[PDB]
């Protein structure tokens, strides 16, 4: 028997990479005790691991929903990085709680809640980041979908099986798609968790709370703040603002999205255009020394923006721009130069895909130096194995 999409201890050894990035960094201080819906993995396990690791030596509980290794499966990334987390987090004697539930209902709530005035104590900062493909309660089930408004939306899409450019396209959506991506991809479960958290007295003082987004360039608008997805984070964006009222009164804190910069997701390898820009974007701040992955973009945000001796910079909107190195007129252009070169024949060569494809395997725990690939693995090692 094989494994499949995710390595294990690849993904311990993933876990550990950030772990180690964040203890050698500059160090800030701020957050104790933190709480991340969306935990197990991308910007929730970064900003996890850098709020345990940068030096605040936090404690937090991870909400996630993943599953792990039966004796025929051998179960999600997310699910390891979880257990390997707390492993690495109880050896620093740090808490390292794990709620693998669906945060949406009601009864989860309930248990987290109920789990922090008993035992962790008050939040003092909260971060929401789960991206679900799919929503429930009530008792309807509400899907997401990438679409378009008004039009098509087609760009190339990198397919990492076979290191080629495939052109793919995406269609307009129905009002009821438009209906269903905002129940999920915007900020009502958000705001539901901060009111319950602040009623039941769960933040600390001046408390924070972050959600996370994306802008992009001009070439994307038509999906990121046009499309099902822009519709989703204008209302994330609109919720920042009724909360950030809110704790600013009750409790003398802030809300607020942060704007993180392109990424190498799962999710982001089949909408059109954004693979192969993310690509180009790759090789173009590299070779400015700007390239940031998950854990800098995140270690960067905390000393440096939100827990810094400064005051902290917004836009002229009221929210945190991380994407501020990708949208430099310099790099779009850039970008932009490069993009009129690129070809199905030449991508490889001109855009950073090596980078691209070697951070899609690292999130699933492949293509790693530190780990022994040729080696076999124990099913009855990693089911014994518990968050
Ligand atoms: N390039 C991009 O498209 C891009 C760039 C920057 C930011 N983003 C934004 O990044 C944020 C996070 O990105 P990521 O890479 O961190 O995502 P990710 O997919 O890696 O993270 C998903 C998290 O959601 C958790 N989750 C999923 N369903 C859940 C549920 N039902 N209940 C509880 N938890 C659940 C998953 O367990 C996981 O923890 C997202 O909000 C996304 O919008 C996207
Ligand atoms: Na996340």
């Not at 799962?266 to 998950?294: D, G, Q, R």
């Not at 899609?360 to 040729?374: A, C, E, I, P, T």
């Amino acid at each position: 028997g094989f494994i499949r999409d995710v390595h294990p201890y690849g993904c311990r050894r993933e876990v550990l990479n950030q772990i180690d990035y964040c203890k050698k960094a500059i160090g800030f201080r701020g957050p104790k005790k933190v709480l991340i819906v969306g935990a197990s993995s991308g910007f929730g396990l970064a900003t996890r691991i850098s709020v345990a690791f940068g030096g605040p030596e936090a404690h937090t509980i991870g909400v996630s929903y993943e599953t792990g290794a039966t004796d025929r499966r051998i179960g999600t990334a997310g699910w390891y990085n979880n257990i390997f987390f707390k492993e690495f987090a109880k050896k620093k004697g740090l808490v390292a709680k794990n709620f693998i539930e669906d945060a949406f209902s009601n009864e989860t709530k309930d248990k987290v809640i109920k789990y922090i005035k008993d035992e962790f104590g008050k939040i003092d900062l909260f971060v929401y980041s789960l991206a679900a493909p799919r929503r429930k309660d009530t008792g309807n089930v509400y899907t997401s979908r990438i679409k378009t408004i008004l039009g098509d939306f087609e760009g190339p899409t990198i397919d990492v099986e076979r290191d080629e450019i495939t052109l793919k396209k995406v269609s307009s959506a129905s009002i009821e798609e438009i209906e269903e991506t905002r129940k999920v991809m915007g900020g009502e479960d958000w705001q539901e968790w901060c009111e319950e958290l602040l009623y039941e007295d769960c933040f600390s003082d001046k408390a924070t709370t972050i959600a996370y987004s994306y802008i992009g360039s001009p070439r994307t608008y038509k999906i990121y703040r046009e499309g099902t997805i822009g519709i989703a984070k204008k209302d994330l964006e609109d919720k920042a603002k009724l909360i950030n009222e809110k704790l600013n009164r009750v409790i003398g804190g802030r809300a607020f999205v942060s704007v993180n910069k392109a990424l190498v997701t799962k999710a982001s390898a089949y909408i059109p255009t954004f693979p192969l820009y993310a690509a180009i974007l790759y090789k173009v701040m590299k070779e400015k020394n700007i390239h940031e992955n998950c854990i800098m973009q995140i270690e960067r945000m905390f000393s440096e923006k939100i827990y810094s001796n400064e005051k902290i910079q917004f836009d002229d909107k009221g929210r945190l721009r991380m994407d501020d190195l990708e949208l430099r007129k310099d790099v779009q252009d850039e970008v932009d130069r490069i993009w009129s070169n690129i070809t199905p024949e030449n991508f490889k060569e001109l855009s950073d895909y090596k980078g691209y494809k070697k951070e899609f395997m690292n999130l699933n725990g492949f293509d790693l130096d530190g780990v022994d690939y040729s080696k076999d693995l124990d099913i009855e090692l990693l089911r014994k194995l518990e968050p």
